[model samples]
Target: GLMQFTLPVRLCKEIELFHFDIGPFENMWPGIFVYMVHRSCGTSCFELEKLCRFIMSVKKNYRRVPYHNWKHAVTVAHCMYAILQNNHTLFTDLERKGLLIACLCHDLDHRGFSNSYLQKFDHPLAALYSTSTMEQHHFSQTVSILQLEGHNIFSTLSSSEYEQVLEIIRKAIIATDLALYFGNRKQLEEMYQTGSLNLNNQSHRDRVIGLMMTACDLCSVTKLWPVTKLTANDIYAEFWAEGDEMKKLGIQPIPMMDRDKKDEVPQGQLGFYNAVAIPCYTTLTQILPPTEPLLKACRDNLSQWEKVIRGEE
Candidate 1:
């Protein structure tokens, strides 16, 4: 079991003000995670001391990466919390809890390197998981945390319920991988267009859950201009860091990742907004109208990026 730590008075006050619009709070992430879990799942679902330990362990596992650090994980979890707050009736209670935990642990122990880096360098994680290498590792790390003494938040659940929740968590964490999202996106769009998406069907529900994971994972693009710009800068910083490593290995990075091509950043973001963010948010809003605000925020940020690309910022 990990050592227990106390939340100070100031941190508790910050947690009291936690809401969807609250941007990143680097030092308060663990407290925010604790606040969110209690709010979403309630105290009866988890022993408070164990829950605190689990949250701290999860935070500790995330590396000091520019973008995929603990802050990003907590922010993504907060996005899920916000969505669940408005649409709790759409998901089962187990699903709501599992999805929130999955978001918090989705990028556990990220090395600030892309999956392609693991594959190209023949890293052990890539060897273990030929696809979604980092995601698989993240889930494994999550399970490792749960198995620690006094860290099992789901200990109150029945065996069958525990198993089901873990399955949801596994699928959700892995679904954050963009490779899976690309294929799932097409099928989901077709389903929505054809009116074939039914939440009653397990497969259909799973697809929707997968799409939600992607939307939450990329929710950075759906924030205010300043928050969006700050997140994008962190992302590109990580990308450029990886690009530097690739250069050391004599491999040329794509224009988006190359630091020398910094001028292309805005154009690259514009492409991302169109190809990924817009369609993702659009479909999410279509499926759940309560989430329209997320789409609106995404569109607003897209326009800001467009202005940047046009030298009108």
Candidate 2:
């Protein structure tokens, strides 16, 4: 059953502080989305009632998974919001709106399973898309929600603008798949290093948008220590659940997914930071220096994980 809630004035002010790195409060997510949309697009682009309904519908679509739940979606969107707030001139108005919506809907209807699990089991989503199966499903689900009555937050846009925003949403949502990020990362880093990355060029802008999506998707790694650690626990809980399912199918899960190998979490996190999180944030900072705080927080968390591995924290 869907419940309706209102945001107090003070709470709205709190959400306006999007740059503040903090943990999730599930109940506040719908209001947060509403406040963000209103602040970014205003009534000219989105009606308050329609935006609220859309936010609630998106929230309802998310499963009660440990990590990739509605709360996680809101957190990712908040990260994008924070980034956009700081780097306002970097993206156009339409691009910023599309990015926020894409972030909110990126993991719609997640089943607490990884893409590899779905592919291995030949799940229908895997069958429907040979690659980036889950990401494709998430984008499809976002489109489905928009098609529902009273849930089309983009209804106010002109035909061409509507199409453009949807395209941005599709690409941004699919870019959340870490596999795609790995492929896109090196080229983006090389462009930045070579001083050839120009935001004025459409191709460069598209790549930067994808890179930012990856950064926001992994933004939890850059939150304050307590927030980061708690999010990591939630992520591993989901991973372990998937591991349990694999065991039931007579398959062995990887060390990161295996609950029995919990002791390896600190080391796993360290390796993940060194390999994926750090590079993603570092590239983002290079392109958008205003985001250096994100890189700093990630490094601090990496050190925290190191301390954990060394039995010092």
Candidate 3:
């Protein structure tokens, strides 16, 4: 099943044109990176690399939005990097690397539009993964790759190392899908008082990583202008494309993309943001600033699209 393009060593060799000291990330890639992380759970870099490649490959073929691009992988990597660098004292190199791998590979096979869309269609991944985010499916897929024979990078590690790696990936990925952005977090407002994680008074590494993931999710909002614009366009393209597909399936035409509109693209995006993305990421910003503005823009862009949807100008 290994595609010719999955050649890591070859890719590393190709990127060597840039002259990184690491020179081509073939066999020792995830391992070297993991070692560099210092707080790793002794995960097998080989396993992580495999999972990374698998997801990237699938993503190339998926015509969906948001989760369909390599940008998601890069974003996770960037956010994880920022979290580790900003919180330098807290994570051991090993834990840092574990978190890195976890975030990068978390949504490997995502088809965008959230887990809810799949669930409504009775997807097996949806069925097996009871939660709306499909945490179980993602978790199982990650572990399956990590546990493969010969491919298991953690095989030679101390027992503690093995356990830690699995645990770290599981926790980080699960937290991502497992969060109640629109669902459970709201209910907690009535049950609790504070929104922010006590980062100022924090004591443990895991909690820090949790916050790191939140930061990473929001990191796009804080990016320099060019990158932010690029990311925004990518997300919009992904959303509009998905809506286009749903329309073809006769699935209620997704509401916003009606042909009566002078141009359909803008209207579809507006509907998606107001009806879907805003509520999700806005809830996140109350305790996390990393993604607020980005989500806000997403909402704003939706309204702009409303112009085209409404046959204005």
Cα lDDT, model 1, residue 104: 88
TM-score rank order: 2, 1, 3
In model 2, what are the clashing residue pairs, if there are any? none
Q: Cα-based RMSD of the predictions, in order?
A: 3.6, 3.3, 8.5
Tens-digit lDDT track for model 1 on 1-313? 2323346666445433213444445666666676677667665666778877898888889888888988888888888887887786788889977998899889999999989998888899998999999999999999999999999989989999999999999999989989889888889889999998899999888888898999999988887688788778899999999998888889998988899999988888888889998999888888888888888988898899889878897
Top candidate by TM-score: 2
- Please give the lDDT score for candidate 1: 0.84
Candidate 3 local lDDT, 214-233, one digit each (tens): 54554443454344445656
Superior candidate under TM-score, 1 versus 3? 1
Tell me model 3's lDDT, rounded to 2 decimals.
Answer: 0.51
Question: Please, what is the whole-model Cα lDDT of each candidate in the order they appear?
Answer: 0.84, 0.84, 0.51
- TM-score of every model versus the real structure: 0.92, 0.93, 0.58
Q: After superposition, how far is residue 76 of candidate 3 from its true place, in Å?
A: 1.2
Q: Could you tell me how far off, in angstroms, the CA of residue 10 lies in candidate 2 after the best superposition?
A: 7.9
Q: How many residue pairs clash in each candidate?
A: 0, 0, 16
